[PDB]
Amino acid sequence: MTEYKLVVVGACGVGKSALTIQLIQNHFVDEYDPTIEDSYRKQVVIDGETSLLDILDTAGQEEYSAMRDQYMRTGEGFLLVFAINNTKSFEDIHHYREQIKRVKDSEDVPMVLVGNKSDLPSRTVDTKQAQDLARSYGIPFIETSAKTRQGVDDAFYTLVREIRKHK
Numbered sequence: 001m002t003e004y005k006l007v008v009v010g011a012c013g014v015g016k017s018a019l020t021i022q023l024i025q026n027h028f029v030d031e032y033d034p035t036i037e038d039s040y041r042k043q044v045v046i047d048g049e050t051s052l053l054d055i056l057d058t059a060g061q062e063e064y065s066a067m068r069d070q071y072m073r074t075g076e077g078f079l080l081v082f083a084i085n086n087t088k089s090f091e092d093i094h095h096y097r098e099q100i101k102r103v104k105d106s107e108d109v110p111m112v113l114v115g116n117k118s119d120l121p122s123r124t125v126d127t128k129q130a131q132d133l134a135r136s137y138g139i140p141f142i143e144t145s146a147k148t149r150q151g152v153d154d155a156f157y158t159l160v161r162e163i164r165k166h167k
Protein backbone atom coordinates (compact mmCIF):
# COMPACT_ATOMS: atom_id res chain seq x y z
CA MET A 1 0.00 0.00 0.00
CA THR A 2 1.37 3.37 -1.14
CA GLU A 3 1.32 6.23 1.40
CA TYR A 4 0.92 9.89 0.23
CA LYS A 5 1.98 12.77 2.51
CA LEU A 6 -0.41 15.67 1.81
CA VAL A 7 -0.24 19.12 3.41
CA VAL A 8 -3.09 21.68 3.60
CA VAL A 9 -1.88 25.33 3.58
CA GLY A 10 -3.62 28.74 3.43
CA ALA A 11 -4.52 31.69 5.64
CA CYS A 12 -6.36 31.42 9.01
CA GLY A 13 -10.07 30.82 8.53
CA VAL A 14 -10.08 29.61 4.87
CA GLY A 15 -11.39 26.15 5.84
CA LYS A 16 -8.20 23.99 6.03
CA SER A 17 -9.55 22.14 9.11
CA ALA A 18 -13.16 21.85 7.85
CA LEU A 19 -11.88 20.41 4.53
CA THR A 20 -9.64 17.88 6.29
CA ILE A 21 -12.43 16.85 8.75
CA GLN A 22 -14.96 16.51 5.89
CA LEU A 23 -12.61 14.06 4.15
CA ILE A 24 -11.90 12.10 7.38
CA GLN A 25 -15.14 12.12 9.47
CA ASN A 26 -17.67 12.98 6.66
CA HIS A 27 -19.03 15.85 8.76
CA PHE A 28 -18.89 19.65 8.46
CA VAL A 29 -17.28 21.32 11.53
CA ASP A 30 -18.49 24.88 12.04
CA GLU A 31 -15.66 25.56 14.54
CA TYR A 32 -12.31 23.92 15.05
CA ASP A 33 -9.59 25.38 17.39
CA PRO A 34 -7.20 27.38 15.08
CA THR A 35 -4.18 26.25 17.14
CA ILE A 36 -4.70 22.51 16.51
CA GLU A 37 -2.20 21.34 13.90
CA ASP A 38 -2.34 17.61 13.38
CA SER A 39 -2.07 14.79 10.87
CA TYR A 40 -5.08 12.64 9.96
CA ARG A 41 -4.94 9.32 8.10
CA LYS A 42 -7.43 7.73 5.71
CA GLN A 43 -7.30 4.69 3.42
CA VAL A 44 -8.83 5.45 0.00
CA VAL A 45 -9.05 3.87 -3.48
CA ILE A 46 -8.04 6.26 -6.28
CA ASP A 47 -7.95 4.89 -9.87
CA GLY A 48 -7.89 1.30 -8.55
CA GLU A 49 -4.81 1.90 -6.36
CA THR A 50 -5.42 1.46 -2.61
CA SER A 51 -3.61 4.33 -0.88
CA LEU A 52 -3.08 5.72 2.63
CA LEU A 53 -3.49 9.49 2.83
CA ASP A 54 -1.51 11.17 5.63
CA ILE A 55 -2.84 14.72 5.77
CA LEU A 56 -1.18 17.53 7.72
CA ASP A 57 -3.65 20.31 8.55
CA THR A 58 -1.33 23.31 9.21
CA ALA A 59 -2.39 25.65 12.07
CA GLY A 60 -0.83 27.40 15.18
CA GLN A 61 1.66 30.24 14.87
CA GLU A 62 1.83 32.36 11.76
CA GLU A 63 5.61 32.56 12.00
CA TYR A 64 8.82 31.38 10.44
CA SER A 65 10.82 28.52 11.89
CA ALA A 66 13.57 26.19 10.60
CA MET A 67 11.77 23.34 12.47
CA ARG A 68 8.63 23.97 10.36
CA ASP A 69 10.79 23.98 7.16
CA GLN A 70 11.96 20.45 8.12
CA TYR A 71 8.49 18.90 8.54
CA MET A 72 6.97 20.90 5.58
CA ARG A 73 9.80 19.43 3.42
CA THR A 74 8.35 15.92 4.15
CA GLY A 75 5.09 16.79 2.32
CA GLU A 76 4.78 15.30 -1.20
CA GLY A 77 1.82 17.46 -2.31
CA PHE A 78 0.20 20.68 -1.08
CA LEU A 79 -3.36 22.11 -1.20
CA LEU A 80 -3.20 25.92 -1.53
CA VAL A 81 -6.51 26.92 0.04
CA PHE A 82 -8.19 30.31 -0.11
CA ALA A 83 -11.83 31.31 0.63
CA ILE A 84 -13.87 32.72 -2.30
CA ASN A 85 -15.26 35.50 -0.05
CA ASN A 86 -11.81 36.58 1.32
CA THR A 87 -9.60 38.47 -1.18
CA LYS A 88 -6.71 38.67 1.29
CA SER A 89 -6.66 34.81 1.52
CA PHE A 90 -6.38 34.71 -2.32
CA GLU A 91 -3.59 37.35 -2.30
CA ASP A 92 -1.71 35.11 0.23
CA ILE A 93 -1.54 32.08 -2.12
CA HIS A 94 1.71 33.25 -3.87
CA HIS A 95 3.37 33.44 -0.38
CA TYR A 96 2.45 29.82 0.49
CA ARG A 97 3.51 28.53 -2.95
CA GLU A 98 6.91 30.26 -2.85
CA GLN A 99 7.62 29.09 0.74
CA ILE A 100 6.86 25.48 -0.31
CA LYS A 101 9.13 25.81 -3.40
CA ARG A 102 11.86 27.16 -1.07
CA VAL A 103 11.79 24.19 1.37
CA LYS A 104 11.35 21.55 -1.40
CA ASP A 105 14.27 23.26 -3.36
CA SER A 106 12.27 22.85 -6.56
CA GLU A 107 10.22 24.87 -9.02
CA ASP A 108 8.07 21.68 -9.70
CA VAL A 109 6.18 20.60 -6.54
CA PRO A 110 2.74 18.85 -6.77
CA MET A 111 0.08 21.41 -5.75
CA VAL A 112 -3.62 22.08 -6.31
CA LEU A 113 -5.33 25.48 -5.93
CA VAL A 114 -8.52 25.22 -3.83
CA GLY A 115 -11.30 27.84 -3.80
CA ASN A 116 -13.27 27.00 -0.64
CA LYS A 117 -16.64 28.22 0.80
CA SER A 118 -18.19 27.86 -2.73
CA ASP A 119 -21.63 27.62 -1.00
CA LEU A 120 -21.52 31.27 0.23
CA PRO A 121 -23.15 34.21 -1.61
CA SER A 122 -20.52 36.79 -0.54
CA ARG A 123 -18.05 36.16 -3.43
CA THR A 124 -15.09 38.60 -3.75
CA VAL A 125 -12.72 36.42 -5.87
CA ASP A 126 -14.05 35.63 -9.37
CA THR A 127 -13.73 32.00 -10.51
CA LYS A 128 -11.93 33.18 -13.69
CA GLN A 129 -9.27 34.90 -11.50
CA ALA A 130 -8.61 31.59 -9.66
CA GLN A 131 -8.50 29.66 -12.97
CA ASP A 132 -6.05 32.31 -14.31
CA LEU A 133 -3.80 31.92 -11.26
CA ALA A 134 -3.90 28.09 -11.46
CA ARG A 135 -2.97 28.30 -15.19
CA SER A 136 -0.06 30.66 -14.44
CA TYR A 137 1.21 28.01 -11.94
CA GLY A 138 0.45 25.01 -14.25
CA ILE A 139 -1.69 23.36 -11.52
CA PRO A 140 -5.32 22.15 -11.24
CA PHE A 141 -7.99 24.40 -9.60
CA ILE A 142 -10.88 22.82 -7.64
CA GLU A 143 -13.92 24.69 -6.20
CA THR A 144 -14.90 23.22 -2.83
CA SER A 145 -17.36 23.60 0.05
CA ALA A 146 -16.50 21.81 3.29
CA LYS A 147 -20.17 22.61 4.25
CA THR A 148 -21.86 20.73 1.37
CA ARG A 149 -18.95 18.35 0.42
CA GLN A 150 -18.69 19.91 -3.10
CA GLY A 151 -15.16 19.21 -4.48
CA VAL A 152 -13.72 17.70 -1.27
CA ASP A 153 -12.72 14.25 -2.66
CA ASP A 154 -11.75 15.94 -5.93
CA ALA A 155 -9.28 18.32 -4.28
CA PHE A 156 -7.41 15.55 -2.37
CA TYR A 157 -7.67 12.92 -5.15
CA THR A 158 -6.44 15.38 -7.80
CA LEU A 159 -3.43 16.16 -5.54
CA VAL A 160 -2.61 12.42 -5.30
CA ARG A 161 -2.81 12.30 -9.14
CA GLU A 162 -0.37 15.26 -9.34
CA ILE A 163 2.08 13.35 -7.07
CA ARG A 164 1.77 10.20 -9.23
CA LYS A 165 2.65 12.27 -12.32
CA HIS A 166 5.65 13.88 -10.54
CA LYS A 167 6.89 10.42 -9.41
Ligand SMILES: *CCC(=O)N1CC2(CC(n3nc(-c4ccccc4)c(-c4c(Cl)c(C)cc5[nH]ncc45)c3C)C2)C1
Pocket (backbone or CB within 6 Å): 009, 010, 011, 012, 013, 016, 034, 035, 058, 059, 060, 061, 062, 063, 064, 065, 066, 068, 069, 072, 096, 099, 100, 103
Ligand atom coordinates in the same frame (compact mmCIF):
# COMPACT_ATOMS: atom_id res chain seq x y z
C1 LIG B 1 -5.16 30.63 12.17
C2 LIG B 1 -4.07 29.54 12.35
C3 LIG B 1 -3.70 28.93 11.05
O1 LIG B 1 -4.55 28.27 10.48
N1 LIG B 1 -2.46 29.11 10.48
C4 LIG B 1 -2.06 28.55 9.20
C5 LIG B 1 -0.73 29.25 9.67
C6 LIG B 1 -0.02 30.12 8.60
C7 LIG B 1 0.84 28.86 8.28
N2 LIG B 1 2.22 29.06 7.84
N3 LIG B 1 2.88 30.24 7.86
C8 LIG B 1 4.05 30.12 7.37
C9 LIG B 1 5.05 31.25 7.25
C10 LIG B 1 4.99 32.29 8.18
C11 LIG B 1 5.90 33.36 8.11
C12 LIG B 1 6.89 33.36 7.13
C13 LIG B 1 6.97 32.31 6.20
C14 LIG B 1 6.06 31.25 6.27
C15 LIG B 1 4.19 28.73 6.94
C16 LIG B 1 5.43 28.05 6.41
C17 LIG B 1 5.48 27.34 5.21
CL1 LIG B 1 4.08 27.37 4.17
C18 LIG B 1 6.64 26.65 4.78
C19 LIG B 1 6.63 25.84 3.47
C20 LIG B 1 7.79 26.62 5.59
C21 LIG B 1 7.75 27.34 6.78
N4 LIG B 1 8.75 27.54 7.67
N5 LIG B 1 8.27 28.32 8.68
C22 LIG B 1 7.06 28.70 8.44
C23 LIG B 1 6.62 28.06 7.16
C24 LIG B 1 3.01 28.16 7.30
C25 LIG B 1 2.60 26.71 7.14
C26 LIG B 1 0.57 28.39 9.74
C27 LIG B 1 -1.33 29.88 10.97
Ligand SMILES: Nc1nc2c(ncn2[C@@H]2O[C@H](COP(=O)(O)OP(=O)(O)O)[C@@H](O)[C@H]2O)c(=O)[nH]1
Pocket (backbone or CB within 6 Å): 010, 011, 012, 013, 014, 015, 016, 017, 018, 019, 029, 030, 031, 032, 034, 116, 117, 118, 119, 120, 144, 145, 146, 147, 148
Ligand atom coordinates in the same frame (compact mmCIF):
# COMPACT_ATOMS: atom_id res chain seq x y z
N1 LIG C 1 -20.03 28.25 4.71
C1 LIG C 1 -18.84 27.69 4.82
N2 LIG C 1 -18.07 27.88 5.83
C2 LIG C 1 -16.80 27.20 5.91
C3 LIG C 1 -16.44 26.37 4.94
N3 LIG C 1 -15.19 25.87 5.43
C4 LIG C 1 -14.96 26.37 6.56
N4 LIG C 1 -15.93 27.17 6.89
C5 LIG C 1 -16.03 27.95 8.10
O1 LIG C 1 -15.01 28.96 8.18
C6 LIG C 1 -14.42 29.01 9.48
C7 LIG C 1 -12.93 28.64 9.44
O2 LIG C 1 -12.82 27.25 9.13
P1 LIG C 1 -11.54 26.38 9.56
O3 LIG C 1 -11.63 24.99 9.08
O4 LIG C 1 -11.36 26.62 11.11
O5 LIG C 1 -10.39 27.29 8.87
P2 LIG C 1 -8.84 26.99 9.11
O6 LIG C 1 -8.35 28.20 10.04
O7 LIG C 1 -8.24 27.27 7.68
O8 LIG C 1 -8.53 25.64 9.67
C8 LIG C 1 -15.28 28.06 10.35
O9 LIG C 1 -16.29 28.86 10.96
C9 LIG C 1 -15.79 27.04 9.31
O10 LIG C 1 -16.99 26.34 9.67
C10 LIG C 1 -17.27 26.23 3.75
O11 LIG C 1 -16.88 25.57 2.80
N5 LIG C 1 -18.44 26.91 3.78
Ligand SMILES: [Mg+2]
Pocket (backbone or CB within 6 Å): 016, 017, 018, 032, 033, 034, 035, 036, 057, 058, 059
Ligand atom coordinates in the same frame (compact mmCIF):
# COMPACT_ATOMS: atom_id res chain seq x y z
MG1 LIG D 1 -7.56 24.99 11.37
